[PDB]
Amino acid sequence: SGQFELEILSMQNVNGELQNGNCCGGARNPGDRKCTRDECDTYFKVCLKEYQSRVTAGGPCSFGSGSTPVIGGNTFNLKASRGNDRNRIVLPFSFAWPRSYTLLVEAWDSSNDTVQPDSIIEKASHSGMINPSRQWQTLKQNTGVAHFEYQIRVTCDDYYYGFGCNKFCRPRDDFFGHYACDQNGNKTCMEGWMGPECNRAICRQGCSPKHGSCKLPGDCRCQYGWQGLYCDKCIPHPGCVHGICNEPWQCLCETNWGGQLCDKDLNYCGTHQPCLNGGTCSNTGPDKYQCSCPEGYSGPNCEIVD
Ligand SMILES: *[C@@H]1O[C@H](CO)[C@@H](O)[C@H](O)[C@H]1NC(C)=O
Ligand SMILES: *[C@@H]1O[C@@H](C)[C@@H](O)[C@@H](O)[C@@H]1O
Numbered sequence: 001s002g003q004f005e006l007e008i009l010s011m012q013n014v015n016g017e018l019q020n021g022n023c024c025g026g027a028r029n030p031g032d033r034k035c036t037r038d039e040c041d042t043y044f045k046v047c048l049k050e051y052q053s054r055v056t057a058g059g060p061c062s063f064g065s066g067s068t069p070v071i072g073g074n075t076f077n078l079k080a081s082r083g084n085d086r087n088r089i090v091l092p093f094s095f096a097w098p099r100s101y102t103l104l105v106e107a108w109d110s111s112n113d114t115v116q117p118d119s120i121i122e123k124a125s126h127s128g129m130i131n132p133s134r135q136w137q138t139l140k141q142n143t144g145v146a147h148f149e150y151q152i153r154v155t156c157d158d159y160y161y162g163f164g165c166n167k168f169c170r171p172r173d174d175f176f177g178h179y180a181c182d183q184n185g186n187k188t189c190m191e192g193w194m195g196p197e198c199n200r201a202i203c204r205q206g207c208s209p210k211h212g213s214c215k216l217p218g219d220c221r222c223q224y225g226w227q228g229l230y231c232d233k234c235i236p237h238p239g240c241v242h243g244i245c246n247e248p249w250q251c252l253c254e255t256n257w258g259g260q261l262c263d264k265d266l267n268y269c270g271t272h273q274p275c276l277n278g279g280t281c282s283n284t285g286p287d288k289y290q291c292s293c294p295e296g297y298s299g300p301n302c303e304i305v306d
């Protein structure tokens, strides 16, 4: 999600005094009060926590804490230097960044090779607001005897967006989405795709909303029983001749066509003209008729003469 980073820029402790007024090491040469015996072994402690309207010097470091190894003597300047792992403190976070925070930074002196313990040189504290940016914010602690400069920032981890580094967005072209990310981490769909995660293919222009569907953009796949470019037309019953459908597998007959498959001619007389030698045809049912034969003509079609 994100990272709160702090970089030490410079320290200035001309004499080599701690918070308690004493020197780093031993004796202070009388009169001029110069500390000469030894230089401080300066390291930095950092504590990051929830915003406090009224700052406390003690409390749990909610968002994180860390310390630098000894990075210098009494005085150092790293303001034109690059800044490495020894002079910087990284504090990662997975929660959404609240913007408001409380930061404690302290310069300390190492005393592990002696009988006395590690002691505080100076202590810095502030509460503020900071948004995710690559741009460093410089802070000076100069109120006391010892002064130090540090800079802080909050950056979003890869694929994280917004003011809290919480909005994840990584681009795709698979069964879960077809999209690119924009500057705000919003999903902009590829050509042919739609929907919140860009997983709906846009069909053929005019494709049936009720009988057509897509898997890939452009196409129009027909529901079973529908057909045509737009899946607009039903498929009639197989074996249906001289028949239409409204719904699939129907076979609703055309005029003068009867039966299950509209194979039977209800107007055989008109279609074939069967009676010969001046006979009169009359339809007597499906593929049936009868002939009224003139005198001297006999048979089903008046074909028997004399
Ligand atoms: C686009 O991104 C902004 C800020 O990152 C967000 O507030 C907004 O809801 C997004 N717009 C859409 C249409 O998703
Ligand atoms: C039908 O009946 C036959 C017998 C003839 O009279 C025809 O002219 C008529 O149309």
Ligand SMILES: [Ca+2]
Pocket (backbone or CB within 6 Å): 024, 025, 038, 039, 040, 041, 109, 110, 111
């Ligand atoms: Ca020391």
Ligand SMILES: [Cl-]
Pocket (backbone or CB within 6 Å): 125, 126, 127, 128
């Ligand atoms: Cl403040």
Ligand SMILES: [Cl-]
Pocket (backbone or CB within 6 Å): 010, 011, 012, 147, 148, 149
């Ligand atoms: Cl300084």
Ligand SMILES: [Cl-]
Pocket (backbone or CB within 6 Å): 176
């Ligand atoms: Cl996945």
Ligand SMILES: [Cl-]
Pocket (backbone or CB within 6 Å): 194, 195, 196, 197, 198, 199, 200
């Ligand atoms: Cl979707």
